[model samples]
Target: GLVPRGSHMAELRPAPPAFASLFPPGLHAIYGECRRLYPDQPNPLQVTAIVKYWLGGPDPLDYVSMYRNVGSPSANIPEHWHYISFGLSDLYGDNRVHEFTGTDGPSGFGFELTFRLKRETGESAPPTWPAELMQGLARYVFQSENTFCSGDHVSWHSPLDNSESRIQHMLLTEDPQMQPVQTPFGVVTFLQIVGVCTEELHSAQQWNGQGILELLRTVPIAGGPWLITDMRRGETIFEIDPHLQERVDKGIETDGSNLSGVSAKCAWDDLSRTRQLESVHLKFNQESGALIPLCLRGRLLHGRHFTYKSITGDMAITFVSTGVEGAFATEEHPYAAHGPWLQILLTEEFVEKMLEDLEDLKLPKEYSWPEKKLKVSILPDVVFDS
Candidate 1:
């Protein structure tokens, strides 16, 4: 069937000849510099060459098509042997479904080439692609064409023995959300899932899709030495080693048995600490419709630096919310005041105090510990006077 002619496949005209006349004498010097940067390279074809090819000049379209396919999937020839015009029709008819051979597949796909016009002094606007045409063709193909097939399980070959195993491990348990487990050594903050890509590549999978999860440990001035232990099985793919002179002189100690089979170690005296209050309480009055503020009295002894640590707490706060008429609205009425809204707000002051106190206490910045300065603000529901 003959494809209907539409604006989607309209041919664009070449830029004006006067464009070259606008360039100053400095353009020659710039061209010289470009030639120096790319010595032994042939000069690029001018727009005239494009026009000549389009007009069915003596030159064969095969060369032009090859050049176009270098960066454009739509310009690539299909894997099957067919007429060039038919291939062009297939691409122009539907860009998404009817992919160009050797150019539009997931592994070998290429991007379309773009051209731009530049002025000497002002900001240059990027050249626009045939987006509307491409989009229209894509929609048409998606709706009607059945030339392409979609499949899962893309193949990625690596010349390593455990490549398949590593890939499967990554695919199966890529980023496990692990809770921090307290061990005899110290709090084992879940760092990441490390995958050994055979003996060649090593990758760390993080929960948030970011790789290379780093953890720190903190030791208080009064407590004993703190250590980071790994509980996972099979020779332990990951471990924490102490930052010591011997370890530094030799390479980083990746052996699991060097330092108590733990990832890292820290002593109490090696740390610093500071003292500060942790939490603040805000009370709302249901009777008077006012905000009551109070300060919680507690001290924190933690590390001065931020480290992902496991914390267990049985502490909580209780507050009463005002049901004042003009306060806030609930689902019952369009504009009526809501009965009460309960929320917990974490304060910045509490965090700062916790860090300051840890520094004052001479706690190791590498270790993490529980601090009382951490505050949790709670707003509970309460009935207001009518």
Candidate 2:
């Protein structure tokens, strides 16, 4: 009973548009905000996920809208194209993609993301890499459940775009013009992601991200008033101005470090594993071992606790103040017995010598601090491609 058919092509249908009146109030609020910022441009370049996260797609972000903006020539700001994300916050209030909050709770992750890139000379269309970069960040948030706020920095450790640029890291700050929007879900703030180099990220970790942001604002070639990211710039802020490096060093000496915890490749020898062991030994990757002195000088010396968590395992070692002005490692504690959790108590007096020894420590070397019956080993370096 089958009929003969000449055409064998499969039927196709248009994908569902993201912007529609049928969406929830949160989606409408976000759309209205973009409209307010760009009233003249009804249609901007947008990259939307065909299968949204709610529909079991891999990409978490729903859409990234790119628009051109005129920069202030008087302020040394360059004309740029701004990109904004739509999925970090609660775009749908059905409690499927995001939670349905009550009165004053945060909406989804409490913030969306934005990026401003300087426009190329005579370029008519914006590049698509920013959308991909934004989705990369979104995937991190959705996977890790770690939310980014103003003054928080991330060690991207990879080229943000396909080009061979040295701008590999990111520093987060609030958008200058975009205000927090109130929606049925809650309040959502816009966070701008600024590209930075490795040296600048180190400075931000040593001092503070906000202080680094101020330094970036002063340089016109760096991020300007609108904080447009220029991937072409190769020099770090410190290399550009040696005085700034001195300033950051002073800040570390005076105010201590802003980083409280860092993902590190570190672990301590469990005394329970060897009852006949004579001394305690700590192991760390060479790259992470180099930062121990920085954290000791910046955090521990300032009476602040510093934590180093294992990147591959659940082990974490925290350095705390020794009340007796001595140094010791906790081994008989409950947490120590439960897992690889360890706490190394360091005194101001002992840390001075620890810093001296660790500061000059190099790779493939074994060091012993006889004062606390502790031995340390610095291993080969491994890549941290975050």
Candidate 3:
């Protein structure tokens, strides 16, 4: 009774050879594409790792990786690291418990994710932070059962590299190099990850990642193929792009991405009673059930409006509040958030107290926002850890 029969650890069985390491191409397509892009490449694999976690998890080898020639080839822009992950789509098979219904393929999340971070130094040791970011993403998708696709913006509390840098959020766009591929398991779309500064993310979320992607295309694919997103360092790429400024003045469209929905086992705070510090661990810690994270089903875009809804549709959190802007808060970051807002619901009475407190304090324009000083709450019945 201790061991499940179908499992590898069954009393007398060998565990299905740890599920085949490679399938006929779906996730592996990026590997060959990277070679073709830089055929003149002279460096051996700069960094590579096969990711895996938890013995009884959905997939053993969650992802694979490859890196080339370190950073950007041009000196005009910020030198950055080049990294890729055979990310997202199931490496093993379509065995996840709660896969999205009617997906184009068998992927648990129906897509894949990649990233390219700035490499200021020419270190030969290989940067492992980007790889970990990819893993963190995969873990979020798999564990939360929330799938991400092109144009969706995401942030998990700190700089993606675990540093105290200004890079606060990330924007998801179509992988310019690899097209969607079909493997024995399913059709996987390669979604590229671009680290956006708070300002750019603000514009992107207010408009959309597709909006930023279009504006980004204004810059010649020549100066630097990667297209620098680091704006605070005086990177003039996006600023001086062909038609970006004028078009930006016209304003970005708040069109939602091809992928925008998120689903998870969540518990909402009806009266805003949870503290700021207590929220971060709910999503990251699988065993921590004191708070069930809120799940917004998908994003809505209508000309100048945006709404992220609870799966059951009880609450609707609007992003484009002031007509063409969206911002988020939760983490204790000083920099203003620029992407989608992760809104936790609170009762009107609790909200009144927050505003009254802020009014009495009478702080300046920046310090005290009456709406933000609200109380917090957790699940009525917290889920127990095993």
Candidate 4:
């Protein structure tokens, strides 16, 4: 099945003819770079947008091209397909989509997207889903000003393709073959999108995406300098090597978690019995609740702030790591509150109790701690945006 996007697949086209002088220099620069990489294959598999985005087309990318890669056995790079996008950066020097701010400034959004997929059995032509995936992500950039960078992680929740696979999430990194290029507009980088599993996404959240990416370099098909996407990979890096999980756990204790916050269905209540101090109650839906313990252990325990913002409302709960340690202090403890923000301090003992109570929680119920006056509840399942 095709994606929900309008186009089924990109229209195939040959390289622009020599008489085509109207092509922008920034766009032509990337095309020449691809020609230099694949000199023999001048006419690569390309999907050109028929209706230009400036003319109100649904797709944001002007073109996306893919090429057959006869990888190096010496470098352990498997045969793969390299996909690249054309419209994320400033393809036109006329300052239409991107402004010619300065010579040293970054090009539109600063980078273009690329992906490398390992060749599967009996595969002939590259799949069209990669092109749609690039277009969909490009739409977000054109809609919002946010840009992608190396070591960034995204929880896509569903598979990139319509097929059943565990490789649902994405990690952004620099392209190994295509380095950053200086265009007439500015500098443009080739940001590669690597497909990863949910477990790898958790590891990335527990530590950092770049930390997980470094570990992935040791795997078989998913490793290599290119870090090709292998949808058929069932076992995770931790499953292959037990010591990796051990290292992740040790890193959590020492280095703490890199994930500072998450967009979730969560709320907080101030159970203030005495006028002196207030007890904060944190609630989360089942899906987000499962990750609270990990964040608590990784962030709050290591003297770092952990935040959970509500997706449905303007409410948020932030756990502030304080210098005072022991059990959860109730008397004379400072509790700050704004319109929708609630800040609470945690003690090492309270975090332990919270972890213990959350463990093996099957029934949807709320637990109350009489000593510290803290409440932790796991509500029913809730839906989250993909």
Say which candidate scores most in TM-score: 4
Worst 10 residues of 2 by lDDT: 329-338
Tell how far residue 57 is off in model 1, in angstroms.
43
Q: Write the per-residue lDDT of candidate 4 for residues 113-214, one digit (tens) a residue.
A: 999988887989988789998888888778887888899987788888868987899999889888778878888889999998889898888797777887
What would the TM-score be for candidate 2 when compared with the true structure? 0.71
Q: Each candidate's TM vs. the true structure?
A: 0.18, 0.71, 0.50, 0.73
lDDT of 4 at 166: 78
C-alpha RMSD of candidate 1: 26.7
For candidate 3, write residues 200-261 as lDDT tens digits. Answer: 66556544666666665455331245554442333433455545644543443223333233
Which has the better lDDT: candidate 3, or candidate 4?
4
Instruction: Mark the regions of model 3 whose C-alpha exceeds 4 Å error after superposition.
Output: 1-30, 38-51, 54-61, 69-80, 94-106, 216-225, 228-246, 252-386
Relative to the true structure, candidate 4 reaches a TM of 0.73
- Candidate 4's displacement at residue 342, Å, is 6.6
TM-score of 3: 0.50
Clashes of each: 27, 0, 7, 0
Location of the lowest summed lDDT over 10 successive residues in candidate 1: 79-88
Candidate 3, residue 94: CA error in Å? 6.9
lDDT of 1 by residue, 89-178 (tens): 222212332343432232111111111111113423211212222232223333454222211011223311222233222111111222
In model 2, how many backbone clashes occur? 0
lDDT of 3 at 76: 47
